[PDB]
């Protein structure tokens, strides 16, 4: 469901951030590597 | 009816010869001898010398014979004894027939099916088992089919033969009679360019063709014992590829690997990876890795064991992608 | 040590391939025995066609110079080898021409303007009319030979009383497809006429560097078939050789290899200007009162004119689009093409 | 000295002919005539008919000759008039020379450099401009080299000839005299399997070879006018690929596109993609897209300009990637 | 209508290639003048080698059934064609064999055990000893021909007074490479001797299906070079024909094509011909000269068996091939991809 480049997903995984819990502020709702840093921050 | 892929082959040919009088089968030792692998056994005896005949020893000439006969309304199904000998007839296939419809704007066409065995695992001598599907997969105007089961073989060959554009039907030596399967009697067809999911999976997609399909299934079984569910996709047509089935399995698994018997620098694994990278990169958890043979000339007989990719190599690579 | 008669061997075989000649340079019948049975009207139509072709060549070179034509291989000097041979064929015969054999397929039914589209590089130039049995000019030297063997076997199997005729140059005889072609045709006893037009050169390579065989006709011996060496500059000898081969062929006896000796007028002082086929044949016909300067000029004006409207039909042909190229790849387009087709259909709009 | 690419190719041959008595140049119309494109111009005059000679019209024999000559200590540098004719000599190349060392386990080797022109944009007739590098890139034992400039052609050709294994040297027609560039006199080498950055950039990596390098440089300059800094990497050797250079650039840019004149199902673009996906998928901010020709037979001359990929196609594909 | 002498041409040309013979089935000389000049010791060695090759075929077929040998093409019945022709060569000559001409390259210097390794499919089987001028048996029917032309041109170019000899079967004469090879050699006037061993078959295809040419040697006519048809079952005829061709070649007069009429006693890889056997007629020939005897033949036979047994042992003691080995012999300077892969496998080979 989600859409994110591999760099994002493997960054999410490292940080242990279940990618399905992060929204995404990129085109068509793509989860950007900045949306995960904002999931951990807040 | 329990048939071996080779029998399934013979049956598809028998069926076409009977259903269409234009079908002609020729090549080196395919007549009275019935072929070096019995693929055409008893065919000349049933349909005549005028329909199933032998030819002088010259692959190039065979190609030309096919092209010519086609220009006269026949549906040539010539045979190249071993695909390693495709080099002698590379112009007839890639420089000629594959281009006739386009070259003549449709005025002429080539309903030709070239059958040829290949594949390792049976200790053949030099240039018999080389996987060269990669060369022809690159020529606009051709379709390359590679079955792994008797059922797929028959249905694809009948389709192959009926197609009105040149088709290359490669037959793996190790799959000729290594197992039997329920093959329906009578004529049926399997669309060309259509993949086939041999095993539904949810963790990783394992794409393969030829002898590598069964090795992917054998590896899937082991992978399950380890908590990894593998969806094994059998291409069954290496050109054109069934993108729809490929990406669909990928969009679902999020992980994948392509498995071929050819050398890494050959085959068609690189093209599948590319197609996935541009259509489903937004679904991939890890890179798509390839399982292929070392980049050396096909192995001397004795070295096939340590050289040819097997289930163990599919297992190991599936894991690597799994723990990326 | 005693010696094998190798010298005697080469001299003997050579003796089996003398040059067949019916007319000399002055237009005199030097071999009345093999004289071809041709009607006055037939004889004239042959002269007309040869003249027409010389004009097509001259105009083709000019149009190429002006950039109104693209790829073009001169034919001047080979009118007898090309036209007279074509003259011995029937509508039902299939021709597999080389890159230089555009003349032959034009007279067999291919419209002149398409011949020009072929030169420019347009697919419509290769959309041969149905019924007209020819293939677009073959660029891969020798490929037309093995294909000719397949075409011939096809006619044989359909029971047709027609033949497969194809041409290649002297250089082409060194190719493998050349040999395999005539061998296959031989092993199947197929109705095929194999013509080797020898103008002594393959681009800059003289025939002597191609092979050490004294004739190119003798190469037929390797296929186990009959070979004929003809004066490629004599229209009647070329016609007689081909007519003889068509007959041997439709009567189920097999193929024949024919070598015509001729020369090109330049591109692709001197001599051979007296050997020009149009010269002797003209003298031949004039002596029989079958040709006038008036008639010839009529043919010329008729030519220059038909050439103009042909270059005009070519110009008026619609430019090619990618979607066209794709549409003619297969009967049923594969996924990748179905896809690319839309991509370009959108660009095109 | 300011040279054209064909001039540099000649200079390099001349240098090798003088430097090594074993070097031999042969093929169709290369001797007295000096080559259809004047590539061997004057070489026969200076070194003799024993060193630079013409052969009968038959590519297969030319290949067989080179193999034989190499068995007798020579360093064969044969020519194939147009690579569209490689079909006639596929066995001698891929089935023989490329395998000799391997087949003989080192006892014999093939110091053979095969030269052959190819390329579109000059309205040549059929099978004269096809891009078939994709076929030979798949054969273990060969090295495929495709220069884009005078400087590179001369350096690689000297390297190509000195190499002791088979090397295919593809010379693009449009680049023979399209331009001049300063080229060092005397001998020098450019390693095989090494690419170079024809233009430094930071926003997107554009990988190309052949006439496409120029088209890519052209798109780069148009892109720079819009603040899009493109790095153009010239493969200069299509097999083996220079991975470090390629990957090093993508890791810096985050985005990339591979460009080729060949059709999408041909060329070596797909290999480049799979390798990037395999070694730097974690640096990608967008899929690695490809710019290639439609999957149809090479276009009839008049259709070249609407079929052949150009700078406008590259810009567009680069933008697709930027805006992903 | 006019008619060309097509039937005459076919006959007349073929007539130029009558079957050259010296020893008939009973071992009776029939071509005294052609009689090659060989010493008693030379004739005995020639017999020794043919008898030895027979046993090798008999043993090879056997080991191949036990699985101790892989690919193998029988040679029984072709001794005179294969052995007698090789007996005409000098060590300096270069041989380019076909998949069935292992014997020739064996007698030219290739160790028996490497010939067996070739069958098994092992690279060391093709590491021809330096100085031994042979190539591994060629599998692509026809390739050895165009390659032979090159070797020959190469020898001419270096001024060596030697030749290049290559072999192919009847079916192989239909290949384009077959024709291109003899046309090139002839065009370059290169010192090559092309042999065609006609056993009437190409696997299951009779030579009549290959071509309609009355003879195979006449094909040389397409290359404009000399051709000779010889009794493939006649040692002396073959020795002489090849010797004349070598002679012609070293004197720079060009290549020659030689067709040998023989028969292999099957299979691919009849009691009538049993009398046409080359060993039979040659035995009688030597015995009537007091040059041969059962004692001598039993010696060679045992000698062959012993060496064959030992060779099959050496092949077994050859270290099994590894991928690292295969990768290393691909190039002199391994390309990047192979460098990477070499480590992968070197690692995998650690344990
Ligand atoms: C397989 C292949 N190799 C080379 C070439 C290139 C070529 C085009 S034309 C030509 C010379 C042919 O001379 P020939 O005497 O046979 O015919 P003619 O023009 O009347 O003098 C060559 C070598 C092509 N097209 N195909
Ligand atoms: C280019 C190619 N195409 C087909 C084959 C397959 C083959 C291997 S052996 C053989 C028959 C050869 O018969 P021939 O009479 O020539 O020789 P011999 O066995 O001594 O009687 C074939 C067709 C190979 N190897 N290469
Ligand atoms: K088909
Ligand atoms: K080299
Ligand atoms: Mg061939
Ligand atoms: Mg010519
Ligand atoms: Mg045989």
Author numbering:
A (entry chain I): 127, 129 to 169
B (entry chain B), D (entry chain D): 1 to 324
C (entry chain A): 4 to 271, 287 to 367
E (entry chain C): 4 to 272, 287 to 368
The article reads:
The initial stage of catalysis is represented by the structure of E1p/E2p-PSBD with bound pyruvate. The reaction does not proceed because the cofactor has been replaced with the derivative 3-deazaThDP (thiamine diphosphate derivative where the N3 in the thiazolium ring is replaced with carbon) that mimics the ylide form but is unable to react with substrate. Pyruvate was soaked for several days into the cocrystals of E1p and 3-deazaThDP, and this resulted in density in the active-site pocket that is likely to be due to pyruvate binding (seeFigure 2 for location with respect to the whole structure). Although four copies of the active site occupy the crystal asymmetric unit, the density for the putative pyruvate is found in only two. In the remaining two sites, well-defined water molecules occupy the corresponding position. In one preferred orientation, the Cα carbon of the pyruvate is roughly 3.7 Å from C2 of 3-deazaThDP, its potential reaction partner, and is off the plane of the thiazole ring. The imidazole Nɛ of H128β contacts the pyruvate 2-oxo atom, one of the carboxylate oxygen atoms and the keto carbon of the pyruvate. The interaction with Nɛ of H128β might help to distinguish pyruvate from other carboxylic acids that lack the 2-oxo group. In the pyruvate-E1p cocrystals, the inner loops are ordered but the outer loops are not, again for all four subunits in the asymmetric unit. The pyruvate complex is not in an optimal geometry for the ThDP C2 to attack the pyruvate, and it is clear that either the substrate would have to be reorientated, or the thiazolium ring would have to tip substantially.
